[PDB]
Symmetry: D3
Subunit: 144 residues, 6 copies
């Protein structure tokens, strides 16, 4: 199974700091499934304000992590890259079960559902230590 | 109808820079409805990486804007404040119709649906110049 | 009348984050007049320190806003761009009448006075909702 | 002659990062004159965008440097502090003669002219190695 | 064995963003040993410039991580906290063996050597997946 | 004797904000010795958290300053540049004698010891006003 480090990811994702929210993608099975890795550390800029004295990872950035891992494997598979950026179209059945904190390691399990005509839709679940922490169905399109 | 400037907001929202994503809240009708204001400007940190030479507002921060205006009127109404922080639980039927850019002014129209037992759920739609730019149903606890 | 969005602006202004202080320029009449747009939002880096718990837009950044809108229309008109960067030379009669806050929208009305030999000088006034909030006469070279 | 380090300054200036633009104030003669110290280093946030690959100190921040040194000695002298924040009102005869860069050390010589009824006006000149690099007359209220 | 989460750590370390470089401390045996946890993620501010397009963790921040975990257990043990800040005095035998990257998880193993009269000196080794990535002997003093 | 300003430095050091920790390098004698300049100012990001209301320069960034001035003269001498990045391997006999603050000007005196096969090791001492403030022996590869 394929894997991508951060420098490789940068070839398929246009996202940069402070908005590149996966560190690795592993167990990449073509197009259909992968698992994205995101280390959560206190030394991230969002923790300055979310929340002061009580750092907790904003759910929306988890969603964004998920979306980036999905979009990443699709850009890899479809011979696309950055220079052709994604555009988030829908999020459904997004459910947050447990807060995540500095020190936690997020694994974003994404499963295909659909990817055709510059438009993919994945089923994604976020785990921290085989505990499901969030889930959503995320759809985006891509432009050129 | 009630309004809150940024300094007042800061009393009900624990959120600070870089994650305080509403600038005002206006036409606050108790608990049931409001409209949050967010000016989009190029001089915001996320525009460094989203995207380089092509700044466009991340939809998730639109969601977060909506969630903040909701939670803010709920914190105001229920005699709560910060020190009792919110926790986003669900987002459903989230739909992004049109990209927003520096210079745009977002208005987050939120409408009650539910708020009881430290648990509210609102129906929210984001507009730029009477054009609906996004919509979601957001639910959080406190 | 011409207008420029942020991405276009970037071709005429070398300024980048955190010091690109206009979001749009509109009603561009050649070289002679324009109006620069700057949305003020809490999510800007300078509000971390100006001031803590009391965000208020620094007057010098309003100045810098005005200077950029002027220098932009001049760079556009004279077939210049970035790669040829401006150098602020003078500011006179600068007067700040009212504080501006998150949620506010600044319009920088600039009027020609002079532009020849890589050296322009404009009369600029900043408004927030047809209320004059500042004014200055600014001169720079290139 | 009196001096203030950064931690002392913080008691008289409400300004914080990224907008606290003097590091020291020395040769403080009551109320009438001082000299503000500002080290220019590449590791400052504004150099990210002013300019990319060509760091050069923004003139308006030099202005702001001067204003802060003035407002500081006034806050010290008049038994004021932060909690009573300044408001910049005018800038006149502002003239920038030479660009300043990382590695440079700015000295802001300020001279009284006026300070009464929460309203001072100073004559300020900025030097880098006994070379005048800018000058302005600045007035603010409190 | 004791452990401290980030909010607890904040009581014993005065360090804040962008210079709080441990996320957790675990297996805290009094004063004598612990292991500090630091997740390395791309979304940290230093990665903007170290290096552009090639994020690699600066060794000096690893040293700093180590020093913070040592100083943390000492502040805990000695009934100290922040408000009494540390002051780094020496670093010796600092050796960096392998680069660390976004996605990596740092464990800082620290062992006592000395702690008396507001002055401690620890032996510290940084591992990523039971692989020694760095080591140093770090001494600091504390003031009140 | 050779000198490099910040823009030149940028050609030999891959490091950028917020981790470019020298502003100049002067008295560059080939490869063998130099002196790096770093102005310490309050307006640097690390001073946000090191420490709040008590800014004091982190010793490790002093080390990093020294390492950068070393690696910079080595990159200059050996016809290298950035695109071939350095990797810090050892630090020994590192000793911090006196805290440095905003307003201070650091000078990093570095002296060769060794530089062969993409592997240099220098003896470095940091001074503020002819007072030795720190010292280390630093070794890196490329």
């Amino acid at each position: 199974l394929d894997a991508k480090d951060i420098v490789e990811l940068m070839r398929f994702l246009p996202h940069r700091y402070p908005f590149l929210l996966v560190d690795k993608v592993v167990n990449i099975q073509r197009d259909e499934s992968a698992i994205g890795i995101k280390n959560v550390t206190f030394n991230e800029p969002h923790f300055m304000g979310h929340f002061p004295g009580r750092p907790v990872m904003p759910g929306v950035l988890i969603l964004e992590g998920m979306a980036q891992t999905a979009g990443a494997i699709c850009a890899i598979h479809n011979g696309f890259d950055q220079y052709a950026p994604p555009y988030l179209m829908s999020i459904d059945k997004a459910r947050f079960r447990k807060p995540v904190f500095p020190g936690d390691r997020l694994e974003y399990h994404v499963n295909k559902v659909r990817n055709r005509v510059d438009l993919w839709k994945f089923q994604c679940c976020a785990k921290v230590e085989n505990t499901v922490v969030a889930e959503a169905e995320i759809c985006a399109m891509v432009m050129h």
